[PDB]
Structure 1
Amino acid sequence: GPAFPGMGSEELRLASFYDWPLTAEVPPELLAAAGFFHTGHQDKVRCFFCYGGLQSWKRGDDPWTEHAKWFPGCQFLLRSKGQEYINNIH
């Protein structure tokens, strides 16, 4: 099961980005879709399922790509994107 079931909703995750500092650079919509919510501190985000945290986002970073790069064992990532996608990033 998810590490943090309470952030399993994409809409709740999107709502968490109300004070996101990088709107143009790394869209909240893409982050939320990729399982991430904003912790509220700097640009630190975390996946509701694997609880993997990421920060220091660069402009044009792709949330799904970063998810697979750093947390390839995440089952939310697997269910959403499939194994071929994860394999191709690694």
Structure 2
Amino acid sequence: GPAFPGMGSEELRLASFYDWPLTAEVPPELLAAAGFFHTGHQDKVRCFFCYGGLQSWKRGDDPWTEHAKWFPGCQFLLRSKGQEYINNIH
């Protein structure tokens, strides 16, 4: 199961980005869709399922790409995007 079942809802994850500092650079909509919620500190986010944390986001970063790059074993990622997607990023 998920590390943090309470953030399994995409809408709850999106709400967590109310004070996100990088709206134009890395959209909250895409971060939330990709399993991430905002910790509230700087640009630190975490996936609700694998609990993997990512920070130091660069403008134009693709949240799903970064998810697969750093946490390829995440089952939410696999369920959502499929194995071919994960394999191609590697």
TM-score (norm 2): 1.00
Q: Distance in 2 between matches of 1:30 and 1:60?
A: 11
Q: Identity of aligned pairs, percent?
A: 100
**1:43 is paired with a residue of what secondary structure?**
coil
Q: Distance in 2 between matches of 1:82 and 1:8?
A: 18
Structure 1 stretches of at least 4 aligned residues deviating more than 6 Å after TM superposition: none
Q: Distance in 2 between matches of 1:40 and 1:74?
A: 23
CA RMSD of aligned residues (A): 0.1
Q: Distance in 2 between matches of 1:56 and 1:19?
A: 16
CA displacement at 1:69 relative to structure 2: 0.1
Q: Distance in 2 between matches of 1:36 and 1:76?
A: 11
CA displacement at 1:12 relative to structure 2: 0.1
Q: Deviations over 1:11-57 (max 9, x none)?
A: 00000000000000000000000000000000000000000000000
Q: Distance in 2 between matches of 1:36 and 1:18?
A: 13
Is there any run of 5+ residues in structure 2 with no aligned partner, and where?
none
Number of residue pairs matched? Answer: 90
CA displacement at 1:62 relative to structure 2: 0.1
**1:30 is paired with a residue of what secondary structure?**
helix
**1:26 is paired with a residue of what secondary structure?**
coil
Aligned to 2:35: 35
TM-score (norm 1): 1.00
CA displacement at 1:63 relative to structure 2: 0.1
Alignment of 1:6-85 (within 5 A): 6-85=6-85
